[PDB]
Amino acid sequence: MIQRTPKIQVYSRHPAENGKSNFLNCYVSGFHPSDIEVDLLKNGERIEKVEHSDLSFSKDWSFYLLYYTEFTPTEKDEYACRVNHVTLSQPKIVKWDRDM
Amino acid sequence: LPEALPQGQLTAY
């Protein structure tokens, strides 16, 4: 069966300022089928309180979802998004880079 | 508002 692997972007709702509350986003898109597993990580550990948008899809039928959680960036804390999907042999981890 | 249920039977694929 034809399947499409997710695109993943990790970024903040607002321009990141250390010590200022913000939202950490992980946008997964372009995937099919719709089952997908997305974690936001803080220093490698799964963040517990993560919400996501309602499943919808693009004109090419590929699905997209926004996972998000409140966070306060610091200089030291590392944030990441961990995604698994049927198209992935192992979870893909995309680090949050405030310049991306 | 989404497409409303026809008078008769909603036609499946």
Binding site: S34, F57, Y68 | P2, A4, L10, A12, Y13
Partner: protein, 276 residues
């Protein structure tokens, strides 16, 4: 400006894990305003934008009945399509439908849409005439024949030219402060050396609505399509969208590069340069 309403239905089978899930979401332009999820503890149509909350219980119940009935019909449809493709009972499959109406800047119907997919592939679509169908394959032809016999196209047309436009207009008026407000991108250019002889110029657009945007790099006024890294426009989570375009340029040539930004919200299209 121009506006559209779309509903997106996704029905997903999952043999061994209960009946197929059906989820419907409604959008006006890039603003979701309603959801229904048959997997919810208490499945019902829920508001997802403030301007729809003023709709009365009759509205919610009407939506809910519609989505509940679709839930059941889509389960039949999944069964049917499994058969049309001679597929085993073992696999999970997905039917998607997206439909809705587009208005032009005058609020007149521009055109309707009603397209379906199976396992992510075009399956059957209502043609722009809202009268005839395009079936992707012999399986979809079975659906086409069934829908032609039941004069489904006529039903879809009546909805697309009627209720669809009427309700879209109502939503546009009710949510006019947001739905009919274009927020221009906030823009800047960043510069990051990637070596002694190359640097990345990244052109940022943030906080814009709707999502439609054009972000391009030019070198000496020529489009740098192939050399531009262009991320997918992405939701910020506050209704707005973000996008950037990046080019790697020879160190010292930065001023030969211009970022151009077109967006509905902008008084004037933007030209930006890196400003050291």
């Amino acid at each position: 400006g121009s506006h559209s309403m779309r509903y997106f239905y996704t029905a997903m089978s999952r043999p061994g894990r209960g009946e197929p899930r059906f989820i419907a979401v409604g959008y006006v332009d890039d603003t979701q305003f309603v959801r229904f999820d048959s997997d919810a503890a208490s499945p019902r149509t829920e508001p997802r934008a403030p301007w729809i909350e003023q709709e009365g219980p009759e509205y919610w119940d009407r939506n809910t009945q519609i989505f509940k009935t679709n839930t059941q019909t889509y389960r039949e449809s999944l069964r049917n399509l499994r058969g049309y493709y001679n597929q085993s009972e073992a696999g999970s499959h997905i039917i998607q439908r997206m439909y809705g109406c587009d208005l032009g800047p005058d609020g007149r119907l521009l055109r309707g849409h009603d397209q379906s997919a199976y396992d992510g592939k075009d399956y059957i679509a209502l043609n722009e005439d809202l009268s005839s169908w395009t079936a992707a394959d012999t399986a979809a032809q079975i659906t086409q024949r069934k829908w032609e016999a039941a004069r489904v196209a006529e039903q879809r047309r009546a909805y697309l030219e009627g209720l669809c436009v009427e309700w879209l207009r109502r939503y546009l008026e009710n949510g006019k402060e947001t739905l009919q407000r274009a927020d221009p991108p906030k823009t800047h250019v960043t510069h990051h050396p990637v070596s002694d002889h190359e640097a990345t110029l990244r052109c940022w657009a943030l906080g814009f609505y709707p999502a439609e945007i054009t972000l391009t790099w030019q070198r000496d006024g020529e489009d740098q399509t192939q050399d531009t890294e262009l991320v997918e426009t992405r939701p910020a989570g506050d209704r707005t969208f973000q996008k950037w375009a990046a080019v790697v340029v020879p160190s010292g040539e930065e001023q030969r590069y211009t970022c151009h930004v077109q967006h509905e919200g902008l008084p004037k299209p933007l030209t930006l340069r890196w400003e050291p």
